Amino acid sequence: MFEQRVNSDVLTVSTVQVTQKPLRDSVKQALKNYFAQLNGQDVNDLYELVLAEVEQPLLDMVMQYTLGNQTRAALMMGINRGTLRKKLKKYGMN
Amino acid sequence: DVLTVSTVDQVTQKPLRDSVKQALKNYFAQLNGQDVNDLYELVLAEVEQPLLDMVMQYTLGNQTRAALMMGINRGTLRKKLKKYGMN
What we know:
Two copies of one chain form a homodimer.
Chain A: E1 12-15, E2 19-22, H1 23-38, H2 46-65, H3 70-77, H4 81-90
Antiparallel strand pairs in A: 1-2
Helix pairs in contact in A: 2-3, 3-4
PDB class: transcription activator
Keywords: transcriptional activation region, DNA-binding protein, transcription activator
Assembly: dimeric
């Protein structure tokens, strides 16, 4: 009945003829390899595991982009400074 | 380094964070001063979807085992699945 509002910009990486492929596929491949090594081992924190692998490079890139300005970083990210501060502290980036 | 992707004519493993960084580098380069207010959401959708897809395949669609493996409650799991039209 109704369409949605979302950011439709793309995130891609290079693959090799060289072409781009969606970032989501890298996450997918990394998980396949992860399960392959796990071989039925117990895991109970996969969300946290993946999130840490993704948030760190994101925080660094946005901070680098805003030259360290946290106010503009929170704005660009669509998160309040409180949540931003919390994520940085979480990864020792304070 | 439990999360890695294959890279190449020999193939070697590189951390997933390196893929995320490369993609953001491409993203920021084309931003061209344009403004953005939801970059976290854009990245989240890009990584949550494949994570959900893979965990659900690996647990045969069993929500209770999927949520335990992820370390989130089922209500949360369900909300994310519905958000991405995967329910």
